[PDB]
Design an enzyme around this catalytic site. Structure first.
Site, short mmCIF file in Angstrom:
data_model
loop_
_atom_site.label_atom_id
_atom_site.label_comp_id
_atom_site.label_asym_id
_atom_site.label_seq_id
_atom_site.Cartn_x
_atom_site.Cartn_y
_atom_site.Cartn_z
N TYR A 1 -4.66 5.83 5.26
CA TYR A 1 -3.36 5.24 4.94
C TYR A 1 -2.81 5.76 3.62
O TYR A 1 -1.59 5.75 3.42
CB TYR A 1 -3.45 3.72 4.92
CG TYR A 1 -3.43 3.10 6.29
CD1 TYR A 1 -2.93 3.80 7.38
CD2 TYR A 1 -3.92 1.82 6.49
CE1 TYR A 1 -2.91 3.23 8.63
CE2 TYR A 1 -3.91 1.24 7.74
CZ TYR A 1 -3.40 1.96 8.80
OH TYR A 1 -3.39 1.40 10.05
N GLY B 1 3.81 -6.76 11.82
CA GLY B 1 2.89 -7.42 10.92
C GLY B 1 2.98 -8.93 10.98
O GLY B 1 3.70 -9.51 11.80
N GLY C 1 4.85 -8.94 6.88
CA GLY C 1 5.97 -8.00 6.86
C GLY C 1 6.93 -8.15 8.03
O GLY C 1 7.92 -7.42 8.09
N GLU D 1 27.57 5.26 0.27
CA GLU D 1 28.25 6.11 1.24
C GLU D 1 27.40 6.31 2.48
O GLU D 1 27.90 6.72 3.53
CB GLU D 1 28.63 7.45 0.61
CG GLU D 1 29.83 7.35 -0.34
CD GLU D 1 30.21 8.69 -0.96
OE1 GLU D 1 29.44 9.66 -0.81
OE2 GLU D 1 31.29 8.77 -1.59
N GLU E 1 1.11 -7.15 18.02
CA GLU E 1 2.10 -6.30 17.37
C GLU E 1 3.36 -6.07 18.21
O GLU E 1 4.46 -6.12 17.63
CB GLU E 1 1.44 -4.98 16.94
CG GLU E 1 0.45 -5.15 15.80
CD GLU E 1 -0.28 -3.86 15.45
OE1 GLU E 1 -0.12 -2.87 16.19
OE2 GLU E 1 -1.01 -3.85 14.44
N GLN F 1 0.82 -1.21 0.00
CA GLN F 1 0.00 0.00 0.00
C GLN F 1 0.86 1.26 0.00
O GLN F 1 0.43 2.30 -0.50
CB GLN F 1 -0.95 -0.02 1.20
CG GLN F 1 -2.08 -1.02 1.06
CD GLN F 1 -2.95 -1.09 2.30
OE1 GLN F 1 -2.66 -0.46 3.31
NE2 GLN F 1 -4.03 -1.86 2.22
#
Ligand SMILES: CC(=O)O[C@H]1C(=O)[C@@]2(C)[C@H]([C@H](OC(=O)c3ccccc3)[C@]3(O)C[C@H](OC(=O)[C@H](O)[C@@H](NC(=O)c4ccccc4)c4ccccc4)C(C)=C1C3(C)C)[C@]1(OC(C)=O)CO[C@@H]1C[C@@H]2O
Ligand SMILES: CC(=O)O[C@H]1C(=O)[C@@]2(C)[C@H]([C@H](OC(=O)c3ccccc3)[C@]3(O)C[C@H](OC(=O)[C@H](O)[C@@H](NC(=O)c4ccccc4)c4ccccc4)C(C)=C1C3(C)C)[C@]1(OC(C)=O)CO[C@@H]1C[C@@H]2O
Ligand SMILES: Nc1nc2c(ncn2[C@@H]2O[C@H](COP(=O)(O)OP(=O)(O)OP(=O)(O)O)[C@@H](O)[C@H]2O)c(=O)[nH]1
Ligand SMILES: Nc1nc2c(ncn2[C@@H]2O[C@H](COP(=O)(O)OP(=O)(O)OP(=O)(O)O)[C@@H](O)[C@H]2O)c(=O)[nH]1
Ligand SMILES: Nc1nc2c(ncn2[C@@H]2O[C@H](COP(=O)(O)OP(=O)(O)O)[C@@H](O)[C@H]2O)c(=O)[nH]1
Ligand SMILES: [Mg+2]
Ligand SMILES: [Mg+2]
Lengths: 428, 426, 118, 428, 426
Positions: free
Chosen positions: D213, D132, D135, D243, D172, D14
């Site tokens: 969202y 998640g 995720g 870098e 969570e 999303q």
């Protein structure tokens, strides 16, 4: 400068129905014989209409009835329409010995008429299966007699091999054992076609979930058209079929090549597609595009012939060969150091009107000799073993005069066949 | 590649009357023999079943066999008898009255030679013989007893052809006479040596099929045979009509038979549904195979989940894809390998016909062989053990001139038939 | 904890050991499943045709591969395994797993053909 | 010269819906792939149409269904559309081990196809969350395997971190403990994104009281586009991503940077506005623009990277750095005296057609390494403590093969993580 | 990701008939199964509930369970029965007559295997199952007793799926027989070990909700179930329809359950208002949450201000902003933290569905677990203490063949459940 396509069995006609349809697509040939200019697959008469140099073999009327009553029947000559009256009953014995012996006097002389028409005969090709009745028994009878007639010509079989999971008839391992000995005894080159791997290709590389024998063979005949006519046609690096007798099989009895072809692109895949020469060759080394359910990862590679179409730059080909040496998981044999024969066609590949294959600008055919093919024969072996253990299905061939010792003989022919490809991988 | 259909008995003449009712309706043929169909498929393969006469008339290559006119009196007075020539109406007087010894051994053989000459009349008129088709009952005295001499003489004439009959298995519930299991006993003693194959039909099993799955109210024998004829027409029209997996019956006879004496088959029909589930059931390939696999779709009163499948034939009808066919065939083997033999990796032979039937888009015909068919034979034999001891009404068959050890020779052959299934069972 | 024990009990009772002929077989086996303390049960197969050969008590640690019930070898090495199997409950059939480290999520297997004696 | 964007979880897809929308805005790219000239995020075909070098990860169809049936679906190829069939059920054990293991062999090989397309692979970027199911679990599985495959490539995670007050799911904190150890074990750089501080930015710096969202991620992807593509694009002082592996973390395990971006101007704020470079940098040091609810006032600053857009005068930049030294309330560490690496882009920042962000003429992105981040981990710690004290929610993971000692293990991994950032501030 | 809805008993067959009345009306579906909707949202997720047949017909993947046809006779003769197939109409004769021991233990088990096979027929026809839905009464003889054997068999078949049923809690005021708390006693003894979760429904609570808040005059059971079905549809359509916080029920089962036996839930529905209060009340996000928080919107007769909330699920419907959602969610936790557990920072799980329902612009669904649910369970047990001592009409269940200590084992398991809520209570 000419050759012959032979179609033995129900399948070999059904494949060649698409093949000669693709051969009409080779020049935009009208269904009467009208074409602007090429005489290799055809015979030209005074009317400017061309007939195929083909052979149609069937012991039933039925498959011929679809041929002689459908499209392209004006193209076909009724000499080549050779039909039978009584079925072989899916038997080797009725195929090789009993029923086909009263047809073979017709069949051989039809070739000798068509061999008389040729100037510079290079050989011929046969389409059949391993486990059929017609395409196994009569093919064993046909390839024997053609070897007696024409010993120094090309003998090609592009054969269908049964899946270890899917078999449409039970005697398909039981027929293929007797076929394979006389196959190795006579043929110069024999391919193996497994529909089960092609099923995985259609559902993934084309995402087709409803294929028939039409949709399978259109994929197959597109490859064979690039194998046969494209090597006959002009390109940048022109290879003929006789060099495959040279640079593909270095063995007396080793001629079971594995053929791959992996531009297999659906039309929705085609809009997001940039595939170079080297990117297709990596797909040629994928297990999902081997055309036979096998694992070439555990197989040692003997010979690799590359056949290209269309957009070819030879410096990019050399990078593609360098890609092979770098990504090595292949276990390439030490007997031949770098034998990678290249075939380049200048002509673009063709697109079936009505098929599901998108237009590409380069097409790649790869021939391979790998050692894992005998594992599929090892799957075929125990299928013959358990049926011979119970002595099942024996009375259909004992009544036809076939000996039970011939079964264990051909098993020892199958065993020594499995000994031979083991000797390639084991020895180094 | 032509077929003669020899219908016999009070049953199989009435049973096979529904068969030609289907086929003449299948190809668009007038009741008097005129052609009205629209497809070359219906025009090309007329040869296998019918004989073309003058005036675009198609003579059925089929002979009705009875010792009585009354059954053929019903057919000739009824519909579709008008296409029959009078040559196929062979009859005498009187009938045996459900007695195996009377038609086979004493009386019917005089009429048999009159039949067999007309068989020689028609088979010589054929272009190429393929096989001769029969249908009767096992407990049919004139149906089987005459036919047991017929199959013995035809195989003596024509060993080269297929010998098949469509036999009615005696139900343990349905009996009109008590010497009915005697007739099935004396039949199979000559059916094994003389026939290449046969199919198994039990009306007791079909009563469940008409009621549990079709929800029919008052089934007749013709309503039973309406189901039978579709299973009859599913077999041999795939030999006729085009297709990809065009399998001969003689091809089928090789694959379905591993042992030459064991050729007793379990027919089945997949698209079975009532009118209520027409609006409710999708027509797919896994839909029909689930009803191929069901025990309650078998035409013989056997539990296929009790025994184990020897060989399976998968006849399909319609426009199907080969991938959906081969996977769904494989998945049944993946689930229920216990239901199979060990020594064969693929007991299922597939027969995909590209040609669809009328009305339905898909259709299918199940043919199987299993070890559970010996259950009905033990129902025959154990009744035969009790009936042989007391010799009830034996003097009818004794006066005809048959021996008691001939019954025992038939019994011992029946007893070995029980053993031959068991030795390949486990 | 984690356990494949009811699923393996669900596997043979509907797919593998189904039938009235297998009912003398499985009644020896269902009591044997209650005997073993391992939560992880593995079924042996000869080929992908799903023919019930034996039953194992494999654990992802170095506990025994030991043959509990059925026809087969006692000891099976992790080199001997060829193809790894699982059981979808809803399909009432098996599905293939890619080659990996075997654990509790794996339900069945097959092994090499030369390990099978003639 | 190329890299990959990876979108694992419902959120990271999303976010990427706005990211590649902004990436189409980078060149005015039409939804077929048409753009006048740049090949870093894209693969160009022969049709002149560009496809993203992206990764779409989901175990549900549902989020992919909005992608494949909405706008820009002609830009995406379904090779990148990777979907699952059974949910991870918001589980680490199903995310890291159970469900995703049947997909990882597909997913890793999709990368190897796309990594084969690249010439000069600089690395990749991953979008996911900490708490998640997909995720967190599958990210821990994926970043492990990619570290095995590509050890010396860039590994970027821009991760969403849950608020201490607002949490959408109860597990969570219970998922984020196991995630963070394997995150630190493999990743090169991991960001933390808290929606609660972004809520304060929308209601004050944009005065928007109805965000979704979508409206959150339009802010976030605008920053990341200035982070990623703008350092790839041409400017006055050009710094690459490698870098940032050099001059942002002087530590082996220290790579949790804090990112700020404070030109955040509403359209009504655009007319009450005269903002120089240094005036934005003072807003970069404000608590209202930290993107994570934290107190950087009590945090010691280790590294400060500056990323500029648009109108930049380097002499005016030097006064802005001098503004930092004069207004000191920052407690900058003594280990690095003046390490303030500057990034200057010549390109102006972009404005979303449909968003609510005003057009500025200079955009400033600031990276920071501060010690107050572990206080948010200290908030996360007692959330794990009280649940483990009751042993709540334990049967969903012990039933899937997780050990209860692994929970206290990752807590000690979380504790040693809190020990490490304490050692930066304490030691001098 | 498909769901099968097994409706049971005289109640839950009538109850869930209203459910599919909603869902077929939700997606624009004809009473006979034709599609007439206008959204791809109504077109894409048909798979979860319905089986697509020929002719754009959608078969309800749902089986009605009863020992009597009369309930299904009303449904089939009534509206929306025409979409049901006769395979789902499984029935026998006679019924148990509100007796747990008759259907579960003696009589209904014969019909159970006929039910389970059709479940096996349908579950094989699916692509991938997600769980099995049920609805019955706790004191329902054919409703629970048949289902308690079903869930014992289904969990034996399918451990991998969600086992949820929808339970009617026995009101202390409304009883027709006196042995009604016996049936709920024997249910929960197997409902704890065999099910993953269930919901709590009391008609006694719903009588107030229809009257105190909605001002309805004469509610039927269907008028109660009209409220129930919206709470039924509020749960699982968020698993189907798109959204930002798309939360699985199997996701929800993890967050709502800390201890695997504590899976008894308190459903709630936020946009409850009468017709007269339509013109007085604006529709905001804090407007619904105030009615989420109220005691008088709960479907079970419990005092949530007396007990303490274990876990809270916040299912939302409509176009809402995440800031207004989360802040209003947070302020309830800020206000009454005494109503919560100590050891969890966020007891509320948010579930935002982007897809709105029809008619309303916004909607919401409250799902909670609290410690106050033991109150109705003590109403079960304290009645069960007096009734066990006198054994009133025990000989009906005694002749069926059950043991008194099995009741005591069910009592002790109920005595566990009283102790189980208290240990996390304070
Ligand atoms: C409105 C309509 O079309 O209704 C159908 C019909 O709905 C059903 C109920 C039919 C119907 O069949 C029966 O009800 C039936 C009852 C007892 C025994 C046999 C049949 C039908 O009669 C059968 C008939 O089928 C055929 O005509 C086939 O081509 C069939 N031919 C015959 O059976 C036949 C009938 C009369 C005269 C001559 C032949 C066939 C089957 C196999 C091979 C070749 C041909 C059809 C489509 C219908 C009816 C009328 C209701 C079904 O049967 C067949 C064979 O299709 C029963 O299971 C199927 C499901 C069908 O849906
Ligand atoms: C003129 C008009 O539209 O009036 C409304 C209405 O005013 C009220 C009073 C409705 C109305 O509902 C009731 O009166 C009612 C009574 C007992 C039990 C359940 C409902 C309504 O029937 C209900 C109906 O709601 C729906 O249709 C929802 O989409 C709902 N569907 C059904 O309940 C349904 C109704 C008939 C057939 C099939 C389904 C729904 C809810 C959740 C999830 C999916 C769908 C609506 C808007 C109205 C009326 C007609 C009065 C209310 O209910 C719902 C569910 O919206 C009661 O509280 C709300 C407030 C609404 O304002
Ligand atoms: N790929 C493919 N396979 C086919 C086709 N037709 C048949 N087959 C395969 O061929 C095998 C069956 O061969 P048959 O056609 O029966 O053999 P035959 O050579 O014609 O001989 P008979 O058995 O006497 O008819 C099976 O493995 C089929 O899957 C086709 O068009 N394409
Ligand atoms: N900022 C932002 N946060 C989001 C978005 N979508 C979800 N989230 C956050 O993501 C967290 C929930 O994680 P999930 O996306 O449900 O989990 P997942 O990793 O995608 O995988 P599963 O749980 O297995 O479906 C919460 O903190 C949400 O606030 C989004 O678009 N933007
Ligand atoms: N809300 C509601 N309650 C019902 C309904 N039908 C029955 N009940 C209640 O449920 C109980 C009877 O359940 P019932 O289904 O008849 O039991 P069973 O059929 O023997 O399993 C009583 O408390 C009834 O008041 C209904 O349709 N709705
Ligand atoms: Mg043939
Ligand atoms: Mg997710």
């Amino acid at each position: 400068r000419e050759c012959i396509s032979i179609h033995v069995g129900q399948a070999g006609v059904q494949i060649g129905n698409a093949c000669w349809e693709l051969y009409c697509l080779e020049h935009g040939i009208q269904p009467d014989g009208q074409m602007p200019s090429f005489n290799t697959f055809f015979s030209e008469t005074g009317a400017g209409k061309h007939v195929p140099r083909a052979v149609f073999v069937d012991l039933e009327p039925t498959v011929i009835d679809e041929v002689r009553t459908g499209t392209y029947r004006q193209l076909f000559h009724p000499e080549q329409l050779i039909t039978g009256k009584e079925d072989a009953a899916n038997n080797y014995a009725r195929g090789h010995y009993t029923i086909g012996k009263e047809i073979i006097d017709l069949v051989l002389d039809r070739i000798r008429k068509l061999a008389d028409q040729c100037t510079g005969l290079q050989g011929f090709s046969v389409f059949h299966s391993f486990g059929g009745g017609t395409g196994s028994g009569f093919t064993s009878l046909l390839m024997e007699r053609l070897s007696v007639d024409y010993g120094k010509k090309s003998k090609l079989e592009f054969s269908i091999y049964p899946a270890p999971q899917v078999s449409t008839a039970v005697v398909e391992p039981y027929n293929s054992i007797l076929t394979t000995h006389t196959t190795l005894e006579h043929s110069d080159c024999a391919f193996m076609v497994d529909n089960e791997a092609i099923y995985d290709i259609c559902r993934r590389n084309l995402d087709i979930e409803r294929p028939t024998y039409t949709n399978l063979n259109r994929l197959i005949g597109q490859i064979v058209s690039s194998i046969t006519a494209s090597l006959r046609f002009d390109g940048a690096l022109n290879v003929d079929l006789t060099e495959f007798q040279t640079n593909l099989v270095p063995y007396p009895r080793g001629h079971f090549p594995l053929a791959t072809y992996a531009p297999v692109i659906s039309a929705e895949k085609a809009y997001h597609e940039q595939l170079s020469v080297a990117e297709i060759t990596n797909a040629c080394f994928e297990p999902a595009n081997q055309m036979v359910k096998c694992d070439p990862r555990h197989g040692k590679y003997m010979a690799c012939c590359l056949l290209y179409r269309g957009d070819v730059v030879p410096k990019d080909v050399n990078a593609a060969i360098a890609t092979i040496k770098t990504k090595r998981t292949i276990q390439f044999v030490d007997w031949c150091p770098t034998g990678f024969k290249v075939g380049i066609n200048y002509e673009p590949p063709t697109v079936v009107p009505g098929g599901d294959l998108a237009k590409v600008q380069r097409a790649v055919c790869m021939l391979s000799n790998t050692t894992a093919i005998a594992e599929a024969w090892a799957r075929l072996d125990h299928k013959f073993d358990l049926m011979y253990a119970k002595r099942a299905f024996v009375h259909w061939y004992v009544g036809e005069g076939m000996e039970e010792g011939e079964f264990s003989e051909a098993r020892e022919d199958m065993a020594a066949l499995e000994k031979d490809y083991e000797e390639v991988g084991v020895d180094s | 590649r032509e077929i003669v259909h020899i219908q016999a008995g009070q049953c199989g003449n009435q049973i096979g009357a529904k068969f030609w009712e289907v086929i003449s309706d299948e190809h668009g043929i007038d009741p008097t023999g005129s052609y009205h169909g629209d497809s070359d498929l219906q025009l090309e393969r007329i040869n296998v079943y019918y004989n073309e006469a003058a005036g675009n008339k198609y003579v059925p290559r089929a002979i009705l066999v009875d010792l009585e006119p009354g059954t053929m009196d019903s057919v000739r007075s009824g519909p579709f008898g008008q296409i029959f020539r009078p040559d196929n109406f062979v009859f005498g007087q009187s009938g045996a009255g459900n007695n195996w010894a009377k038609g086979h051994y004493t009386e019917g053989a005089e009429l048999v030679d009159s039949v067999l000459d007309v068989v020689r009349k028609e088979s010589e008129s054929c272009d190429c013989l393929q096989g001769f088709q029969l249908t009767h009952s096992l407990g049919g005295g004139t149906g089987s007893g005459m036919g047991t001499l017929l199959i013995s003489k035809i195989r003596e004439e024509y060993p080269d052809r297929i010998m098949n009959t469509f036999s009615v298995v005696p139900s343990p519930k349905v009996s009109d006479t008590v010497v009915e299991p005697y007739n099935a006993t004396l039949s199979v003693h000559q059916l094994v040596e003389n026939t290449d194959e046969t199919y198994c039909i039990d009306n007791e099993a079909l009563y469940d099929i008409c009621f549990r799955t079709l929800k029919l109210t008052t089934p007749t024998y013709g309503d039973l045979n309406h189901l039978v004829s579709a299973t009859m027409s599913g077999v041999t029209t795939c030999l006729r009509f085009p297709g990809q997996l065009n399998a001969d019956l003689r091809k089928l006879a090789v694959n379905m038979v591993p042992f030459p004496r064991l050729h007793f088959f379990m027919p089945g029909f997949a698209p079975l549904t009532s009118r209520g589930s027409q609006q409710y059931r999708a027509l797919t390939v896994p839909e029909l195979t689930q009803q191929m696999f069901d025990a309650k779709n078998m035409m013989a009163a056997c539990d296929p989940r009790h025994g184990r499948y020897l060989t399976v034939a998968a006849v399909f009808r319609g426009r199907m894809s080969m991938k959906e066919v081969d996977e769904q065939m494989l998945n049944v083997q993946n689930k229920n390998s216990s239901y199979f033999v060990e020594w064969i990796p693929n007991n299922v032979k597939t027969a995909v016909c590209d040609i669809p039937p009328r009305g339905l888009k898909m259709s299918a015909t199940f043919i199987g062989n299993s070890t559970a068919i010996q259950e009905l034979f033990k129902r025959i034999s154990e009744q035969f053990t009790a009936m042989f001891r007391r010799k009830a009404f034996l003097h009818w068959y004794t006066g005809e001139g048959m021996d008691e050890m001939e019954f025992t020779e038939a019994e011992s052959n029946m007893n070995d038939l029980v053993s031959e299934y068991q030795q390949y069972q486990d | 904890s984690k356990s494949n024990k009811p699923i393996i009990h669900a596997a043979i009772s509907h797919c593998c050991l189904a039938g009235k002929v297998n009912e003398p077989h499985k009644n020896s086996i269902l009591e044997e499943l209650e005997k073993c303390d391992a939560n992880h049960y593995i079924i042996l197969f000869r080929d992908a045709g799903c023919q019930f050969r034996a039953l194992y008590c494999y654990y992802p640690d170095t506990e025994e591969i030991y043959k509990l019930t059925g026809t087969g070898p006692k000891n099976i090495t992790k080199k001997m395994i060829d193809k790894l199997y699982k059981y979808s409950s809803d399909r009432k059939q098996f599905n293939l797993i890619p080659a990996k480290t075997m654990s509790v999520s794996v339900d069945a297997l097959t092994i090499h053909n030369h390990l099978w004696q003639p």
